[PDB]
Amino acid sequence: GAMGSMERASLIQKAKLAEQAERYEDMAAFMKGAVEKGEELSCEERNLLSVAYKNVVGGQRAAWRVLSSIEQKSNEEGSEEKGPEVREYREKVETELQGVCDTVLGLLDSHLIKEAGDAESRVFYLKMKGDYYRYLAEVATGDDKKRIIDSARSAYQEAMDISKKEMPPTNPIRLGLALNFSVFHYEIANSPEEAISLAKTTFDEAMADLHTLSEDSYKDSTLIMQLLRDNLTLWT
């Protein structure tokens, strides 16, 4: 890889610079290089990895949605034939998105997950696996769509099982996992009741544990709890 010659610490330093400069493609490439050094990641380094790829794929998803909407409108009755260009360009963006997802999944499989023994790290990586399979599922239309959806579900479920056994109900990683798995249920698995149930139970169990927290931990937990509430409001 192109980052093979750069020191691990320098890659991390530059990922932080790239973040400050809002250069998320660079940030992701630096963090990929750092992962490929083969050492486990710290908490901060996991955050850098996730922020980088979330921002890159987030942009791709937004672009894909714009293009897919234009494509859908083109295939309505009364729409003038404009040739293959809309489909082609949607496919181009789609293929790039799939590439980034495959890259992230590859880092998780080689070898982040298998070396992650602490609950926080294992849950975080399994959540990421669920997330990137979910992004693949958003654009899937073929023979494998069901298996892609099930790959997302399986990763999220393993993360949920560990999180419930090993982490308090206010832990931000546990909360974020539940938020995202709930969205998976609503948007991907066609299970809006399960989505709502998950978000509500997660919110309520966190509420009951806030009394145990410092001011700073309270801030962190309540921020994600508000996201759960926001989704519940959208869905009910």
């Binding site: 997330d131 974020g176 938020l179 995202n180 969205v183 609503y186 948007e187 996201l227 926001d230 989704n231």
Partner: peptide
Amino acid sequence: FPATV
């Protein structure tokens, strides 16, 4: 779109 983190 719903919130995710």
